[PDB]
Each structure stands twice: as C-alpha cells, then as structure tokens.
Design a binder for these strands. Structure first.
Ligand SMILES: O=P(O)(O)O[C@H]1[C@H](OP(=O)(O)O)[C@@H](OP(=O)(O)O)[C@H](OP(=O)(O)O)[C@@H](OP(=O)(O)O)[C@H]1OP(=O)(O)O
Ligand SMILES: [K+]
Ligand SMILES: [K+]
Ligand SMILES: [Mg+2]
Ligand SMILES: [Mg+2]
Ligand SMILES: [Zn+2]
Ligand SMILES: [Zn+2]
Ligand SMILES: [Zn+2]
Lengths: 100, 252, 227, 268
RNA sequence: GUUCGCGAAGCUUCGUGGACAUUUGGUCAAUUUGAAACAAUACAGAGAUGAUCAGCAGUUCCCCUGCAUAAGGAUGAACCGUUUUACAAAGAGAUUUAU
RNA sequence: GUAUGUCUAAAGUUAUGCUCUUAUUUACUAACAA
C-alpha cells in the first residue's frame, strides 16, 4: 500500500517538528545574534525540582564547554546483521578469472 | 583551643606578595600571568609564610555560617581576611571532616574539584578515582638548603611539621630515596597538609640556615603512589576488606 | 544536540527540600571524566546554603558508571564507585573493575559507548542488586616521673590515631615507627605521665613468653636501623 | 530597505542583562576609558595568542619587540580582523586624544576643530586603515572630495591656509563607514576570538577552486573508474589489485596524450 | 524608618495595633602543585630525481595563521616502516605401520 | 642563508688473504676562502 495521507501528515508533523527544533538549536547556538530572529520544569526522582537557565554575561563565551574536540566514534553495532548473497558459479566463475 | 578565640590575620594585604614572580624570561604575559621569551632555570621557590596554627587558628565568618571548606590561604598561612574570611581557619578534625563527608568524595577540603587522573607528578590536588591519604614529600635536600642532617633528625622534623596539621596514620622516612610518605587519618586532612606544607621550609630558628630559608626551594609535597612493598599492600587490602564489611552491613 | 537525557542526581547529596531551584548551563563544562561538553546543572541545596553543588560529570558518564552526577557515588547505595566494584568483585565473582582509560582521546571514546561497566550492570537492575545484597549478607554469616615512654609490641596494622585516642580515653605527643615498633611516646608533662600510669596489646616499660617477643622486636629493630 | 523584524538592538539587549550598568560620563572620559579598555582588550588578545613579543604602543601602533624567528613571525601575522580593530581604535584614539588636548588646556577650540577635521580628512595618512580593508579607499576618497568642496566654499574671499575646521560631513562619512563595518567586525573578530577559545573547526573541508580543480577532478575520475572496474570484476579482488588497475589507467592516459596507441596485451 | 489607627503625658511628646517594604552573588575563590606558547643553547639544515626547480592534491584519533568554504604555513607536518595461512590438488621417490 | 625538525633546561614514589706505510684520482659536500 502506498502510504496513507493521514499517516503522511503524521510523519511530516513529527519530522518537521524535529527538524525545526534542530535548526532552532543550531541557530541560537551560533555567535551571530543576527540569526537569533529566524528561530521558528523537571523532577529527579519522586522528589521534585525547578530547572532554570541563568542568563550569563554576553561577553563571556556562551558555551564554555565546546572547544572543537577530535573524537573517535565507537560504532555501536551491538546487533549483528547478515550480508547474504545467493549464487554458486563454477564453470563461468572459474573460466572467467583466466580472462579477468 | 581554636574555638576559644577569633582567628588572627595571617598577613595584611599590604604585607601580601604581588602576582609578578621572578621575571623568569624577558617579558610578561598579561592573559597568563606567567613570564615568557625564556624559560631558563627552575620556577619554584620557598613560601614566605607558614601555618603556625595555634597562633593563627580561630573563628571566622564561616564558623558562624557552616561553610564546609577550609581556607587554602590559611593552610599557606597567608590569608588576608582573618576573621572576615568565608573559608574556615583551623585544622580539620573528625567533626568537620564528618560534616563535609558527603561532598568531599568529589572535591577537596579547599572546595575545588578533583579530577579523573593525578597530574602526572602526582603533584596537584588528588584524583577522585582514588581516596588517597598519603603524601610524598620530595625536595627535603632543597627544603633545608643542603643541610647535612641525620635521617633521624629529618624524620623527626617532618613528624613535627605534619603531625601538627593532622592526625597521622603513619610516617616513614626513606634514607635510600631521601623522601617521606606521610599517611593521614583522613583525606581532608591529607589535602590540607598537602597545601599547608607545599613550598615550605623544614628549617627551624635553632638551625643556622634560618635567614637563608627563603633563598632555597621549598618542600615538594605531592601525592604518593602506593608502595610496591607487599608488606604494606597486604595491610591495605585488609583495611579495604574491613571497610567493605562496614558498608555492606550498613546497606540493610 | 537536544537535551534528551535528564540529569542523574541522587537524594542525599541534593538535600531534603520539597522544591529547590537549580540552573542549567547547557554545553556548560567539560566533565571530570571524559573531557567532553555536557549540560552543567547547579544549585544551592538550601537558599542560604553557601555551597553550590554543580554536576561534575556528564550524563553519559554517569549512566556508564551508574552513579550520581554530583556525588560520584552509586545512585542506589551512595558509596564510592571503586568500593562498590570491590564489593561486587568479592560476592558472586572474583573480578569486577571499572577501568577508566587515562589517555585524553580514549576516555572520550569510552564515554561515547552506550555500555555499562563491571559493577554498573549489577546495580542498574534492582532485582540483581537485591540478589547481590542477600548474597553479601549470607557471606557475612611504679612511677619515677619520666614523661617519656618507649612502647613495644605494636601490631603492624595499627595507626597512631588509634593509639593517641586510646591514650586520651586513658587520660600530648607520640612517635611510632611500624618497622621497629619502638613507640617513642612522650607526654606534655610528667604529672600527666603519672596520671596515665596510675590509670592503667599494651606492653609498656618506662625508659628514659616475653623472651621471644624481645627477639622478634630485636630482629625487626635491627632491620629498621639498617633501613 | 531596512528589515523590520529585528527590533532587538545591541544596546537594548545589553541593557536587559545585569552585567551592565549605566552612568552619565563626560564624552572625553568615555573616550579615554575606551582607549584604555581597547588597549587592554587587544593586549589581552595578543598575549592570549602567546605572542608577547608584539608590543602594542599606547597609540595603537603595533610593532614587534625582538627580531622574530620565522616560526614566531608566522605566528604573529595577525589577520585583517585584529589589525582592522586596531586601526579603528587608532582612529578613535586620535580624535579622543585631540579632545583631551583641547580640554587639557593645550589647544584652542578652533585648533581642536581644525585638528579633528585634519584627522578625518587624513585618516588614510594617519592610520593605515586602507591596508587591511582597502574598500576604505572609497571613504577616504569621499573625505578628500568633501575637503575639496568644503575648502573652496570656505575659502572664497579668504586666502589659502590650514585653519578651516568644519568636520561635519567627513565625520558623517566615517560614521557610515563604521555602520557598514560593525557587522563585518562582529563576524570577523567573533570568529577570531572563537578560535582563540574553541579550537578551529576540524571539519575543514576545502571547496574546489581554480587552484585545486584539476587534482580534485582527477581523483574523482580515478575513483569512478576504480568503482566501475570493481563492479565489473567478478572475483572481488583486493585494493592492491586496484592499484594495478588505476596505474594502468594513468599509463593509458599518458599514451593518449602522446598519440601512441595504448594496446596492452594481457587485459580483458 | 515613613505613614495610618489607638492609649498615656503635655495642636506637641512617650508607649501600643496595623500598612508599606520583605531573599544579592558565586561553574570562579588572592604565587609554586591542574596545566599555553614560543624563546635561548646545541645539533641538523627542504619532495620527486643525477642536478636545479613551480606546485595541486590525497590519508591522518597532527594541526597552526587566517574572517574564512580565499589562501598560506617546506607542495604546512607525518606518510618511504614493517611485512607469511581462506593453503589446495596431482604425481614421483624414501621411511614407518597395518592388513 | 634559511624554512623546518630534534635536543637541553634538576630534584630522588616507600619491593626483597691480511696488517701496515703512504702518494694519486674521482665524487659529493661545505654560508669556509677565492
Ligand atoms: O589635493 P590633495 O592632494 O588632497 O592635497 C590638498 C591640496 O594640496 P595640493 O593642491 O598641493 O594637492 C590642498 O591645496 P589647495 O588645492 O587647497 O591649494 C591643501 O589645502 P589647503 O590649501 O587648504 O591647505 C591640502 O592641505 P591640508 O591637508 O593641509 O589642508 C592638501 O592636502 P594634503 O596636505 O593631504 O596633500
Ligand atoms: K595547501
Ligand atoms: K599537503
Ligand atoms: Mg611554500
Ligand atoms: Mg617550493
Ligand atoms: Zn581565610
Ligand atoms: Zn548526588
Ligand atoms: Zn564525561
């Protein structure tokens, strides 16, 4: 079945929301205050708490952490996946290498 | 007692030293506060001040508050805020160690965060990953301006110095390595001493090199790797087991 | 990235208030383990408590060790991570370590992996934790006024603090060498010494099968002296 | 046409925070304080970079202290951001200094006016702004034009000489130049200090340009060819066996270039 | 402390009930031991190849300068070292063992 | 002569057919002289 229009609306809604958020994040991240104008509570147990973002001096670096680290990625291919081809060529498969 | 009296000033900010050490190089570097265009010769020197604890220790703003951290500059014996200081001014004890025992896992008694690893020297503030209580005490040769003392004399003087600042688990001087290993009752205490006698003098008024104390290079109080000696290793293991029994019974 | 994981802070640490107000600086420090930016959270435990508590490590690191992000202690038992790994190693097994790679690049890499470390696999699932606990439980079941003494027969394992505290209970200075065991004790006054002696592994002369003991002392002493 | 949505100004934004306060300060005080501030900033930046051997003079005229080792020299070639910043401060330092002089009892107000005018009409000649950002020649040229215009409306019956003030239109020019550049310097110096703090991005990837077009082309080509041959080749041969292939290709290319037919016997 | 109500002395003064106002900042703490970088002295002094030269690339868990997706750092640097198995099938000869 | 690249810059981590003697070539190198 070619996908349902209603379900396409779902997917679009989800992914569109996601990408808009991502782009917002990217934008408010960057130092160019110019691109700030194209930007489209918690509990840590049964125990309860209020999260806040303290506004910091607009001289000091916004994100003190980030420093362009080189980082090697671990693959995390914990689940194994096959590579699975179905053939068995003997006559043409052995006569060819002499040519190839 | 310390609690009987208010803490005296170590030294007034007039008497305090400036942040322009020694001109080690040709020009000063503003953003680093170090020197530059030349690193000819060693940087380190001997502390002008020392924690004379009974003459200094006392009440603070902190002793009113319940500030859980001790004054680095008290340990160094140079705090310019005496009773007006937020950080405390006295030798750490079971009561205060006990008081801050939650937080002190992650950070020092000087309220500064420990790190993953020891600084290659074992020189800076300890790692969180170890709960070390044992200070290596190098540079005794330098700390006494090349005074040919007896090993007994050395170890005794060392004892006199570090026993004053914290309860001792053990001390042992090593003639063959010209150094100390000064295990302490508590990690807080260890931290405190490690700053309190960093860059200090082992010399005394009775010694003849008393006015040359400044001119040498101070005590190199660093942290100690555990001994290869299996004589103490076994003991350590036993201690660990004992501790484990405590906590494990405490879980239920 | 998005603030997907929440902060992993324990109770004791955080303090007994129904509502604290903490702040989050995102991308707010490199952690204390893996040198890697993360959302730094911090708060005064009370309003008027001077000590802020800042979240030292990153959330991934926390999860990995299965610990608090402020205490560096296991979120279940509130104990040092190394210690808990030792405990786990002891019961149910022989070997459970949580090796942090002390090389700045590799640590980052390790942190990135979504894989629990030795002890963390036990303490994550509460059932397994409980099991471990129960197994652990199962496993369980003449005064010349000298002011200056020379104490001998000192257990190698005993510390000076234990000694001095004991003395205080029986009531100053003290010198001990665990090599020799020539416990060169000295009192702040002679009257105090008198008081002590009158109040009396406590073998105690007053210099200024005991035979074999003396021999053992002897050899040990000699060895110490050679050192 | 000015875009309207961005109605959060810089000063307004700053006002919103706690870390700024406001005061009524004399304009000369503001100037002098800003020279001091600017000087501290630039020195901090330079020292941070490590190159303490570049001594800033208080007149914002940068020069090296020692003879520079080649490495050191390379390090110290500060870019068109820092130098441009310096030049703007130099400009400012001049006029503020003139005001100070005026107000410090040295020079008469007419003398001040002339001084300011001189500065504006000779920004080129007083601060190598053009060096770093050459489009400032337009501004300089404009100022020159103004001077030419002004003087010859200022010296109709009056003879020749230096004593004309009237610094308005030139001043306007310089203001508009600053308006133009404020964005540019926010970007430039932004990136600069970011580099000082955060390392430079390690996802460098270079674009094609006229200079590296050919190399890129050829690498793309050999990648394509290699791919095709692997697709063709039924044994699933190793990369080392692709080396033979691509090397073969290279030779073929050369042969074509020569006009010698490339007829290797053993191929398929 | 202001003020609005009350009481006790002389519109003035002492005591009383209100209203107003009611949580700053810290990721930090003052020099060695929690991190710069060159610098100096010494030593060599630069890719092809015989020799002399322009380079542009590429890989890199190397970066620096640069506003940079220009460009330049010696063609920025390092890459040149090490190197055994999806190990087979067939024949011949020699040795042993068994039937 | 350089880029560039190494080097140094001080404090002690607790374990029991040949040898010979010479003279000559050629090559390379040489901020050494001509
Ligand atoms: O035309 P420019 O190259 O910009 O030079 C002008 C010009 O001098 P020249 O005619 O010699 O080039 C002016 O001279 P006049 O045309 O007005 O005679 C003179 O103006 P004053 O006569 O008013 O002095 C002015 O000099 P100043 O800057 O002192 O006003 C001077 O500019 P430069 O001195 O920068 O060359
Ligand atoms: K290049
Ligand atoms: K290259
Ligand atoms: Mg070049
Ligand atoms: Mg070249
Ligand atoms: Zn203090
Ligand atoms: Zn916690
Ligand atoms: Zn981490």
């Amino acid at each position: 079945p070619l996908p349902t229009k209603a379900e396409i609306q779902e997917c679009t809604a989800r992914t569109k929301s996601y990408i808009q958020r991502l782009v917002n994040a990217k934008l408010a991240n960057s130092n160019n205050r110019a691109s700030s104008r194209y930007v489209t509570l918690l509990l840590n147990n049964s125990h309860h708490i209020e999260v806040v973002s303290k506004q910091m001096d607009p001289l000091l670096p916004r994100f003190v952490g980030k420093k362009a680290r080189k980082v090697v990625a671990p693959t995390e291919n914990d689940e194994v996946v096959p590579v699975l081809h179905m053939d068995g060529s003997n006559d043409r498969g052995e006569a060819d290498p002499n040519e190839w | 007692s310390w609690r009987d009296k208010s803490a005296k000033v170590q030294v007034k900010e007039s008497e305090l030293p400036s942040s322009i050490p020694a001109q080690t190089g040709l020009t000063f570097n503003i953003w680093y506060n170090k020197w530059s265009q030349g690193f000819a010769g060693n940087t380190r020197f001997v502390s002008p001040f020392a924690l004379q604890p009974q003459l200094h220790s006392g009440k603070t703003r902190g002793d009113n508050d319940g500030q859980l951290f001790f004054c680095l500059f008290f340990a160094k014996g140079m705090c310019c805020l005496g009773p007006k200081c937020e950080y405390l001014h006295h030798i750490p004890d079971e009561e205060d160690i006990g008081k801050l025992a939650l937080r002190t896992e992650v950070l020092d008694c000087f309220g500064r965060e420990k790190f993953a690893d020891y600084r290659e020297d074992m020189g800076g503030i300890g790692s969180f990953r170890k709960k070390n209580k044992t200070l290596y005490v190098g540079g005794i040769d330098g700390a006494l301006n090349s005074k040919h003392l007896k090993p007994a004399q050395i170890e005794s003087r060392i004892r006199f110095v570090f026993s004053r600042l914290g309860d001792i688990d053990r001390i042992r001087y090593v003639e063959s390595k010209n150094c100390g290993f000064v295990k302490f009752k508590y990690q807080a205490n260890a931290e405190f001493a490690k700053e309190a006698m960093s860059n200090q003098t082992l010399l005394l008024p009775s010694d003849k090199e008393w006015d040359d104390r400044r001119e040498g290079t101070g005590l190199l109080v660093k942290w100690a790797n555990e001994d290869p000696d299996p004589a103490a290793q076994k003991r350590l293991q036993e201690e660990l087991k004992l501790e484990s029994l405590n906590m494990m019974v405490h879980l239920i | 990235e998005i603030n997907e994981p929440p902060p992993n802070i324990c109770e004791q640490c955080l303090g007994d208030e129904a509502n604290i107000r903490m702040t989050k600086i995102p991308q707010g420090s490199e952690c204390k383990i893996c040198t890697l930016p993360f959302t730094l959270y911090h708060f005064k435990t009370s309003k008027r408590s001077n000590n802020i508590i800042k979240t030292l490590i990153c959330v991934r690191c926390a999860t990995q060790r299965n610990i608090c992000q402020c205490c560096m202690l296991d979120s279940r038992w509130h104990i040092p991570i190394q210690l808990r790994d030792h405990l786990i190693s002891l019961v149910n097994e022989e070997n459970v370590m949580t090796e942090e790679a002390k090389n700045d690049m590799m640590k980052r890499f390790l942190s990135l992996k979504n894989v629990k470390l030795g002890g963390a696999q036990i303490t994550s699932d509460p059932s397994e934790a409980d099991n471990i606990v129960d197994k652990l439980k199962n496993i369980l079941l003449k005064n010349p006024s000298t002011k200056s003494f020379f104490l001998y027969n000192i257990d190698a394992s005993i510390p000076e603090w234990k000694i001095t505290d004991t003395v205080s209970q029986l009531l100053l200075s003290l010198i001990v060498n665990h090599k020799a065991k020539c416990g060169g004790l000295r009192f702040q006054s002679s009257e105090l010494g008198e008081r002590f002696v009158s109040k009396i592994i406590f073998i105690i002369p007053w210099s200024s099968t005991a035979e074999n003991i003396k021999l053992s002392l002897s050899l040990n002493k000699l060895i110490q002296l050679e050192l | 046409l000015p875009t309207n949505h961005n109605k959060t100004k810089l000063l307004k934004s700053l006002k919103n925070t706690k870390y700024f306060q406001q005061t009524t300060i004399d304009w000369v005080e503001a100037g002098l304080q800003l020279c001091r501030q600017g000087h501290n900033m630039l020195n901090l930046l330079i020292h941070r970079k490590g190159l303490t051997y570049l001594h800033l003079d208080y007149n914002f005229n940068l020069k090296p202290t020692k003879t520079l080792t080649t490495k050191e020299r390379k390090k110290s070639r500060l870019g068109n951001s820092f130098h441009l910043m310096r030049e703007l401060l130099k400009m400012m330092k001049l006029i503020v200094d003139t005001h100070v002089q005026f107000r410090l009892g040295n020079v008469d107000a007419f003398q001040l006016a002339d001084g300011i005018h001189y500065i504006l009409n000779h920004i080129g000649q007083l601060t190598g702004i053009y060096r770093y950002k050459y489009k400032v020649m337009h501004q300089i040229r404009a100022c020159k034009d103004l001077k030419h215009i002004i003087y010859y409306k200022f010296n109709k019956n009056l003879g020749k000489g230096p004593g004309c003030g009237f610094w308005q239109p030139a001043w306007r020019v310089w203001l508009n130049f600053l308006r133009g550049t404020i964005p540019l310097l926010e970007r430039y110096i932004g990136n600069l200090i970011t580099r000082q703090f955060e390392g430079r991005s390690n996802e460098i990837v270079k674009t094609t340009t006229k200079q590296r077009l050919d190399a890129y082309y050829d690498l793309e080509l050999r990648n394509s060819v290699m791919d095709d041959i692997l697709e063709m080749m039924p044994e699933s041969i190793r990369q080392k066996k692709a080396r033979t292939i691509l090397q073969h290709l290279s030779e073929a290319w050369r042969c074509w270039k020569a006009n010698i037919p490339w007829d290797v016997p053993g191929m398929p």
